Amino acid sequence: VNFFDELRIGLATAEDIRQWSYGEVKKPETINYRTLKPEKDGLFCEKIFGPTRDWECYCGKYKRVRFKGIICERCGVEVTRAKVRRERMGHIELAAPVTHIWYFKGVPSRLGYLL
């Protein structure tokens, strides 16, 4: 509940990020400029993070209040308060490995000393 004996910062890894996130962003499109709704798998799609509103399935199939933890097959979204939208993340998949800017540029450069 509120017990924190310690706090340790660990260096993550690809599989860790795979575990953390709930989606795979693929398009840069922001909220729609006409209907003011997210685009399919866009940067705000409810299929990634969650419903814009609370207890509201995207297609309206399970919009009733008495729905919690039930994922809608018709629209592929989960039914929970809008707060859950603030507590879920997404991960981009890379087609080419990269480096962490904080290391090859930091002074001292951890990569330089280690390698």
């Binding site: 509940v1 924190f4 660990g10 990020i17 507590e87």
Partner: protein, 1089 residues
């Protein structure tokens, strides 16, 4: 000697006569604009002043521009003679209808084609111009505006001098600061390298550039033979040759470019002789010429630097280095040689509104002419017309943005007429084109012995902006260039001269200025042989009574307008006087005003020029009057009517009215006041009332600046004010639809909307309480109606609705904007500020019943009790004398004269020996009743109607306690003292918050009283809590009452029930911090184990 026709009669403790009336207090603000636009009156005034060339502002700016031309020389354009037209609509409608007081201007442009030889001339429209009303204000979009003057250092030459700490030798530095161009610095150093720094470059020897012009070396030798160090420098320089010199100069300026003679020869004239690239204001050229005494006999026309100026400057520098006192140049009369000072008012000019507007329109004209010339160069040459050339968007946009966002366009604070006048007369020193707060030195914020007569030393804001915001003196008037002046009468051979002249700073220094207060015989003969005097700078010393040349006009020649109406100003302290002056600009207009019993003679004049009181133009006879309008019949048979606005919200939230003070069938003379605006009584300022004060500590309720008030004030509306709020809602179109105001609103009980009418607005005259609905609307449908904010109430006096159907201009994207005015009457209550005119603030500690206050021996209860320990420490003894004089004037006096005038009554005006009850008296600043006068007067007050005199000779009296009922053992002081009312009311401050709307982005409660939000909790409070060792309280304050949502809900539910408060949870801040730090690949675990 009441200049105005029918001002109230109030004899004054006059001893000296001022030979000139106070000049129009707003003439300074209006003269600038009058010059800028150009009108016959300004031309006549300029001709009277003797200036040879009458030149307007618009004409000057748009004549120095023309004739524009293309580089091929086959085309040219000219356009001059700007003229204006009539008004669009009167000021009242412009302010009420949301329009902008303006007028159109037309310029006659002539379109000439070189190779052909044709002329195409016709009028052209050039947008609108925000004309200036007769009260020196700009009405923009219905909101009042007032631009404040500014202080800038006049472009010229300043000879600085810095002493070396090691060498201990004088280094004379001369720096030229033109309007725009290059900066030249000639400094003699220990190494003797007399060089130049053009555009912050390396110090290159002056001889290099001197020869670069082709100046003959023999002429260098002969003209500098008297100079020794510079002769050594000449012998020390290596490079010689006009071509070599100019090429070296060009390389130093522009290295890496083809070095050729033509390049440097052209660059010289381009950087020092092409007027467009290098320009100086006529003020700068005139000041430089006066400084060197060169080119004095001719009116300056060319505004470019010239070589003779540079050679004379270097000669002056070397002569100063030699230590000479005065220097002479052929063609120039003798002048002294000395260093200049930055903080002297012979250098710091004043740019009125004219200069600012001229510069802005100049920028606009440059932007327009660039595109015009490009268009004419590229556009077809056959059928081109000036109508197609001129583009009007840039200039109008420039003026509009200057009026909108420029820091020199501030809303005219309008608490009372005095505040408006002071704001119109202000002298700013910061803002665009000026120094910043951190870079401005601390020395500039201090006085300078040349401030006497130009900028008041007392009036100044208390905040950090101290010394950067002054105010014109009473008699100061700006010269046509921008150097403040001040009147003087010149003594020819020891006899005073009634005729007067105006002298600027420089001429003031060069003469001897006498003292106004020094006694002078009626025949003009100096009774004293030795008369004190002010000298060059900070020097004062007696001198024989013949050599004295100039004498001031009146003792009040250095005070500001606000400080000029503080009685007994010669007795208080500097800080206290400044505090009182600043306080006077914060009064609140009451409902029933009363003129002060003791006040300077500069009250009615400061009100007539304040503009907030109407006045007849021609001497006529009134036919009929009414509470809303008046009709005066002129002697020529022309009937005229004046409309008086009643209960119109002031620019700062207070009310404004006008109540005519004239009767039906009176031949009112021209210039006689007809109506009294806010804070006025019979055409003279009245910011407060007259209360009977007593000075004694009373049961600690008046402890440490507190104050006690009798309930008689509360129950008699003696200090009752009116405040008018203002709200507005709008229905703007959206992509999802257009919102419409409608009486109906979803899911609302009939009682809630019982006030709204058919059209969807609250009916006029319906009481409204906090949290009530004020106007209903539907959002495509949701409910977003406007409701009264937290902590407002009162009647609804009027509703204004603007509709697009009726062809009413509205901001783009809106259809119906409606504003509602709510007016509330506030009675003075606990927690309100009060303060006299001597800067003694306070708060109403407690309002006792009328039956409890101490009462005089005859049953007259006092109205306010002041503490005594704060008088001698603050050292503001003036207020005691004011109280004594107030009581003396109120009770009326009659000095014995049967046996003859008492010695102490020798200088009293012969008409001031016999007064009536509730008499009026006025003590001009620095010339008022002396202590002997008060001593004599207090011994002759008329007895009360009961036959007995209350106060003693000293001024104290015997009281009777209201609680115990027995007399105090010792006498106490009493009298009538003027009391104002400040704007820091209590209803605005008080506020509470238990549970209410929560912010959506930060999950924290809103802030501000209007939004019904909680208070801030600074880190210092966290430190204090930590110091006490309190942990759980801090945990609550940080977790359960600010962030944790479920925590808030659970604690509220538990409190509603009888359950114990559950322990707080995890704050939203920490969880956000996690979910944000996990995004940088830093796996932040918890390790609950």
């Amino acid at each position: 000697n009441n200049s105005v026709p029918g001002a109230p009669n109030r004899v004054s403790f006059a001893k000296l006569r001022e030979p000139l009336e106070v000049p129009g207090l707003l003439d300074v603000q209006t003269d600038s604009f009058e010059w800028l636009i150009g009108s016959p009156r300004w031309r006549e005034s300029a001709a009277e002043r003797g200036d040879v060339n009458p030149v307007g502002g618009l004409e000057e700016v748009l004549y120095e521009l023309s004739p524009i031309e293309d580089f091929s020389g086959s085309m040219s354009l000219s356009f001059s003679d700007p003229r204006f037209d009539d008004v669009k609509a009167p000021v009242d409608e412009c302010k009420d209808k949301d329009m902008t007081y303006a007028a159109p201007l037309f310029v006659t442009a002539e379109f000439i084609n070189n190779n052909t030889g044709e002329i195409k001339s016709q009028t052209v429209f050039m947008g609108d111009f925000p004309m200036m009303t007769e009260k020196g204000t700009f009405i923009i979009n219905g909101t009042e505006r007032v631009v404040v003057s500014q202080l800038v250092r006049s472009p010229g030459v300043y000879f600085d001098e810095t002493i070396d700490k090691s060498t201990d030798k004088t280094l004379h530095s001369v720096k030229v600061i033109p309007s725009r161009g290059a900066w030249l610095e000639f400094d003699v150093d220990k190494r003797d390298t007399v060089g130049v720094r053009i555009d912050r470059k390396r110090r290159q020897p002056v001889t290099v550039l001197l020869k670069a012009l082709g100046w003959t070396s023999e002429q260098i030798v002969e003209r500098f033979g008297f100079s020794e160090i510079m002769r050594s420098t000449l012998e020390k320089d290596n490079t010689v040759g006009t071509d070599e010199a100019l090429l070296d100069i060009y390389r130093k300026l522009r290295p890496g470019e083809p070095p050729t003679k033509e390049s440097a020869q052209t660059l010289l004239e381009n950087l020092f002789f092409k007027e467009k690239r290098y320009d100086l204001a006529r003020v700068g050229r005139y000041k430089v010429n006066k400084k060197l005494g060169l080119h004095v006999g001719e009116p300056i026309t060319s505004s470019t630097l010239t070589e003779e100026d540079v050679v004379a400057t270097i000669e002056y520098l070397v002569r100063l280095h030699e230590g000479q006192t005065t220097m002479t140049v052929p063609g120039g009369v003798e002048v002294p040689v000395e260093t200049d000072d930055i903080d002297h008012f012979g250098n710091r000019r004043l740019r009125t509104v004219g200069e600012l507007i001229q510069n802005q329109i100049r920028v606009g004209m440059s932007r327009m002419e660039r595109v015009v010339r490009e268009r004419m160069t590229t556009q077809d040459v056959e059928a081109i017309t000036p109508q197609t050339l001129i583009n009007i968007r840039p200039v109008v946009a420039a003026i509009k943005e200057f009026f909108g966002t420029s820091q020199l366009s501030q809303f005219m604070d309008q608490n009372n007429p005095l505040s408006g006048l002071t704001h119109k007369r202000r002298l700013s020193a910061l803002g665009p084109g000026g120094l910043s707060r951190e870079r401005a030195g601390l020395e500039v914020r201090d006085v300078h012995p040349s401030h006497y007569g130009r900028m008041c030393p007392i009036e100044t804001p208390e905040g950090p902006n101290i010394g950067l915001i002054g105010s014109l003196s009473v008699y100061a008037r700006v010269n046509p260039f921008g150097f403040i002046e001040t009147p003087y009468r010149k003594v020819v051979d020891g006899v005073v001269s009634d005729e007067i002249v105006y002298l600027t700073a420089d001429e003031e220094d060069r003469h001897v200025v006498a003292q106004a207060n020094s006694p002078i015989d009626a025949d003009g003969r100096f009774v004293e042989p030795r008369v004190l005097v002010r000298r060059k700078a900070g020097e004062v010393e007696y001198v024989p009574s013949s050599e004295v040349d100039y004498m001031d006009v009146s003792p009040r020649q250095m005070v500001s307008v606000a400080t000029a109406m503080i009685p007994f100003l010669e007795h208080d302290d500097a800080n206290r006087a400044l505090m009182g002056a600043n306080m006077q600009r914060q009064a609140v207009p009451l409902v029933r005003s009363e003129a002060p019993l003791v006040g300077t003679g500069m009250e009615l004049r400061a009100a007539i020029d304040a503009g907030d009181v109407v006045v007849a133009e021609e001497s006529g006879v009134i036919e009929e009057v009414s509470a809303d309008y008046i009709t005066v019949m002129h002697d020529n048979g022309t009937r005229r009517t004046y409309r008086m606005r009643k209960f119109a919200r002031s620019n700062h939230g207070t009310c404004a009215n006008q109540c005519p003070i004239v009767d039906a069938g009176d031949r009112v003379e021209a210039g006689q006041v007809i109506a009294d605006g806010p804070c006025t009584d019979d055409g003279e300022m009245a910011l407060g009332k007259n209360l009977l004060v007593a000075i004694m500590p009373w049961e600690g309720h008046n402890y440490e600046d507190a104050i006690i008030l009798s309930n008689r004030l509360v129950e008699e509306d003696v200090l009752t004010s009116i405040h008018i709020e203002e709200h507005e809602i709008d229905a703007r179109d959206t992509k999802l639809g257009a919102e419409e105001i409608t009486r109906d609103i979803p899911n609302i009980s009939d009682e809630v909307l019982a006030d709204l009418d058919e059209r969807g607005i609250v009916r006029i005259g319906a009481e409204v309480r906090d949290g009530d609905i004020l106007v209903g609307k539907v959002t495509p449908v949701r409910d977003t109606s406007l409701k009264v904010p937290h902590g407002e109430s009162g009647k609804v006096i009027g509703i204004r609705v603007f509709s697009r159907e009726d062809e009413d201009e509205l901001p783009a994207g809106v259809n119906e904007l409606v504003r509602v005015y709510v007016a509330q009457k506030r009675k003075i209550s606990d927690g309100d500020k009060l303060a006299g005119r001597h800067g003694n603030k306070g708060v109403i500690g407690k309002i006792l019943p009328v039956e409890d206050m101490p009462f005089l021996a005859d049953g007259t209860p006092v109205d306010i009790i002041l503490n005594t320990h704060g008088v001698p420490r603050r050292m503001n003894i003036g207020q005691i004398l004011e109280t004594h004089l107030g009581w003396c004037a109120h009770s009326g006096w009659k000095v014995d004269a049967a046996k003859g005038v008492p010695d102490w009554a020798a200088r009293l005006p012969d008409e001031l020996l016999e007064a009536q009850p509730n008499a009026i008296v006025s003590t001009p600043v620095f010339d008022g009743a002396q202590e002997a006068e008060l001593q004599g007067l207090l011994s002759c007050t008329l007895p009360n109607r009961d036959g007995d005199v209350l106060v003693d000779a000293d001024g104290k009296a015997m009281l009777f306690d209201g609680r115990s009922g027995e007399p105090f053992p010792y006498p106490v002081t009493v009298g009538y003292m003027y009391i104002m009312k400040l704007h820091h009311l209590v209803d605005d401050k008080i506020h509470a918050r238990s549970t209410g709307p929560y912010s959506m982005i930060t999950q924290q409660p809103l802030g501000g009283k209007a939004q019904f939000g909680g208070q801030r909790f600074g880190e210092m409070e966290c430190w204090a809590m930590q110091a006490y060792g309190a942990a759980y309280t801090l945990q609550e304050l940080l977790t359960i009452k600010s962030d944790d949502t479920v925590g808030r809900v659970k604690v509220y539910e538990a409190i509603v029930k009888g359950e114990n408060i559950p322990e707080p949870g995890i704050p939203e801040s920490f969880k956000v911090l996690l979910k944000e730090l996990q995004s940088l690949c830093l796996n932040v675990e918890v390790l609950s184990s």
